[PDB]
RNA sequence: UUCCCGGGCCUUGUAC
RNA sequence: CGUCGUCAGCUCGUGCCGUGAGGUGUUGGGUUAAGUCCCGCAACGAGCGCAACCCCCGCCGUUAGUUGCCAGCGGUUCGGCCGGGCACUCUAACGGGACUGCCCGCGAAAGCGGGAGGAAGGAGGGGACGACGUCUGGUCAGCAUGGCCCUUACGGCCUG
């Protein structure tokens, strides 16, 4: 419910420091997605089609949402700064400001803009994220 | 085998009797892949049984089968370069295997000139409880249960 | 009443030649029997891959000949002149027998 | 596979039975086939190089 | 009127023709029993008949070619199965579970170079 | 080891026979012998021209020879005289009115035999082996050529011990049938013996 | 899968 | 060309760690015939590998019926023998079909157990295919070639 990308399955190690390599996978996913919707699929007998289906499914699961990033982002929003410490390190290394919904077991110093709250309790995340996205939409 | 369980092949039941034990028996009689000859031998033998002994030879065959069916077997074990003929339980499949095997070898062992008469005599005697196959079964049984001290080697 | 023999090593060019002949004949008036496929003949050569020893190598090669039949019925004169004129592919071999 | 041996096989040897077959490429006389007139090694090489019309790797 | 089935097993091919009648079977213009004379497995051909309370309704004309006697019988079996299926589809519901509508597809394996016959390696000793 | 011929593996599909004609058992041997003789003569002569392939066709008591050359200028000559004598040669060798034809290969960097003879000549001229191989593979890679691989046999730089060099880049799927991998072998003769060079080039699929 | 033979991978002591 | 061995392994690009040699990837849990696949994991991929693409066998269909075949017709000196017909087998070419595809249940997933439809059911059965390399492996007597050696002889021709 916004133009902003997201990562919600598993943070692949090196989405930022190795952005080009992951962009290669983005391109690959684009090419597959184009191919399956093309009238040239009558070649490549059924079994190879099934293999390509598996490949496409995997890339769709993992790389969905990330596809929107045509280049490096402008900021990062993380639910848990500790669970996603790798993303925090990458953002720090590439001078990308960090927004975190931290808790009692987090490091405040590693986040530029910190929201002291909860990481469990679905209600809390719902409220915070809803407010944030509403502020995003309103300011466009 | 290291992974699988080696599924048992399901034999096609015999035509005249509609039985699988008969098929297994005739298969065990087989040599050089001559099915027709083995079946002819079996049929002649059962006809001889019918003439000599009043009742149907199917029942006498089966009765001999569970007569010559053992329960204990001794198996070798290699611990510190020594032999340990531990007794062990036999599954019904294994029971059937050795039963049929002993029956056939004993049939071939008789001094009668014709094969059919040999197998018929062995069958009737094994049904009664005398002959080579029976004596061998009590042989293996007495070899078993005589070294019960080795039973701790569960294996 | 005229039988047309097609022999080849490559089945594709043989089929193309047979198709050309049948089409040309069919255009030229009278009907034809149609392409009759015949059992291909196979020659086999087993060799030793090694130049000196290891007689357990034994690579295989095959040479197969494909056959056709046309059997044009009710010959027409202009049909006849239509034959022996159409240039055949290089690989294909032709034979005519009444 | 001496040269002299190569030319010795190309003359009528006064009788039929003395005549035999030599490889037309290397002069071997041990594994020559009537159909091609080549030894097994030369046959294999030429088959692999694709210089034999219709001859192909067999598998069935 | 023609109830037809193919039947193929181990290189043997059959052609079966069932028609209403008193239950007379003939192969190659000869009696069944005479043709497979002495073969204990002959009766292994027509249990597809007795499975469906046939053997009293159908006269059979069989033309069978290729393979050996056992293959002959198996081809006949599959042929009659297919013909009975062609007669009335419902029979399938009671034929398939018994294993009569499957085409057995095990043939002679190709003899392989380096082996005596396709599996058996030449004996070697004194390692 | 002991990889098979990449061409012989694909005779059925993606590759085609060099010789295209039919003959019975009665006259197979004679045609094959004369074809071999023709190929020998042509390879001996036109080496300077940069020979690629020799196609032999027969239709009816006649031969249609097609020659793939890097530079047709050498073969044809100043006003088409050379070919004439060449024709005569073949006409003298086998008296069945042969019809010589010349075809020029587009972008000679994408023909394995040409790369092979080039590298062989480099070796014969006492070049540095490794550097030459890297240069060759890079040159092949520049002109599309989805894969390139070059192997040199042994006896590098007149050494006492033979050794394979080998170098490749791109995709070279030798195991896939639908590969269309072009193959070329050349032999180089030097003061210290013979060297073998192999070149594989991978061009698309299907 | 205890043992006989032949392999693969992961673990530990003394030399290049 | 043989063998390790049709064993499953051998590497690279970019990014991360360490001052550096280097490491990660390629380890751990599980599962496969497999570095096959899933999850976890500072790594994401790629190349040679495996698998697939190719051939044969197994089911069906469309073109094609002579030297192949003979179900329903008419003769037959009763043997497809003739007249006759491509229904069937076959013969070849082009395709369809098998994909854990559907259902029940068990698992976080790869998957597992059991069913149905099918000729075939969980790499359907074989073939061709041999990775980086090891073995100073084999072959100068298939051939090609470096260096030595002989050239009234170690060359060549006949009989035994
Ligand atoms: Zn030769």
UniProtKB/Swiss-Prot annotation, chain A:
Q: Which family does it belong to?
A: Belongs to the universal ribosomal protein uS2 family.
Can you supply a Gene Ontology BP term from the record? translation
Q: Tell me, what does this protein do in biology?
A: Spans the head-body hinge region of the 30S subunit. Is loosely associated with the 30S subunit.
Q: How does it assemble?
A: Part of the 30S ribosomal subunit. Contacts protein S8 and may contact the N-terminus of Era.
Locate the coiled-coil region(s) and give their ranges: 18-63
Q: Which UniProt keywords apply?
A: Coiled coil, Ribonucleoprotein, Ribosomal protein, RNA-binding, rRNA-binding
Species in which this protein is naturally found: Thermus thermophilus (strain ATCC 27634 / DSM 579 / HB8)
- Relative to the complete UniProt sequence, the shown stretch is 87 to 226 of 256
Q: Which GO terms describe its cellular component?
A: cytosolic small ribosomal subunit
State a single Gene Ontology molecular function: structural constituent of ribosome
Would you tell me the protein name for this molecule? Small ribosomal subunit protein uS2
Curated annotation (Swiss-Prot), chain B:
Q: Quote a single Gene Ontology cellular component term.
A: small ribosomal subunit
Q: Which UniProt keywords apply?
A: Ribonucleoprotein, Ribosomal protein, RNA-binding, rRNA-binding, tRNA-binding
| Name the record gives this protein | Small ribosomal subunit protein uS7
GO BP, one annotated term: translation
Q: Which family does it belong to?
A: Belongs to the universal ribosomal protein uS7 family.
What is the originating organism of this protein? Thermus thermophilus (strain ATCC 27634 / DSM 579 / HB8)
What Pfam families would the database entry show? Ribosomal_S7
Biological function: One of the primary rRNA binding proteins, it binds directly to 3'-end of the 16S rRNA where it nucleates assembly of the head domain of the 30S subunit. Is located at the subunit interface close to the decoding center. Binds mRNA and the E site tRNA blocking its exit path in the ribosome. This blockage implies that this section of the ribosome must be able to move to release the deacetylated tRNA.
UniProtKB/Swiss-Prot annotation, chain E:
What terms describe the molecular function in GO for this protein? rRNA binding; structural constituent of ribosome; tRNA binding
**PROSITE patterns annotated for this entry?**
RIBOSOMAL_S9
Matching entries from InterPro entries are given as: Ribosomal_Su5_D2-typ_SF, Ribosomal_uS9, Ribosomal_uS9_bac/plastid, Ribosomal_uS9_CS, Ribsml_uS5_D2-typ_fold_subgr
Family recorded in the similarity comment: Belongs to the universal ribosomal protein uS9 family.
Function according to Swiss-Prot or TrEMBL: Part of the top of the head of the 30S subunit. The C-terminal region penetrates the head emerging in the P-site where it contacts tRNA.
UniProt subunit comment: Part of the 30S ribosomal subunit. Contacts proteins S7 and S10.
Its protein name is Small ribosomal subunit protein uS9
UniProtKB/Swiss-Prot annotation, chain F:
Q: Sorted alphabetically, which Gene3D superfamilies does this protein's record hold? A: 3.30.300.20, Ribosomal protein S3, C-terminal domain
Q: Which SUPFAM superfamilies match?
A: Prokaryotic type KH domain (KH-domain type II), Ribosomal protein S3 C-terminal domain
Q: How does it assemble?
A: Part of the 30S ribosomal subunit. Forms a tight complex with proteins S10 and S14.
**Keyword annotations for this protein?**
Ribonucleoprotein, Ribosomal protein, RNA-binding, rRNA-binding
InterPro entries noted in UniProt = KH_dom, KH_dom-like_a/b, KH_dom_type_2, KH_sf_prok-type, Ribosomal_S3_C_sf, Ribosomal_uS3_bac-typ, Ribosomal_uS3_C, Ribosomal_uS3_CS
* Full protein name: Small ribosomal subunit protein uS3
Lineage top rank: taxon: Bacteria
The family note in this entry says:
Belongs to the universal ribosomal protein uS3 family.
Looking at the UniProt record for this protein, which Gene Ontology cellular component terms does it annotate, in alphabetical order?
cytosolic small ribosomal subunit
Protein purpose: Binds the lower part of the 30S subunit head. Binds mRNA in the 70S ribosome, positioning it for translation.
On whether Metal-binding is a keyword of this UniProt record, the answer is no
Tell me which residues make up the KH type-2 domain.
38-106
Among NCBIfam families, the record links this protein to: rpsC_bact
One of its GO biological process terms is:
translation
GO MF: mRNA binding; rRNA binding; structural constituent of ribosome
Pfam families tied to this protein: KH_2 (PF07650), Ribosomal_S3_C (PF00189)
Lineage of origin: Bacteria, Thermotogati, Deinococcota, Deinococci, Thermales
**Keyword Signal carried by entry:** no
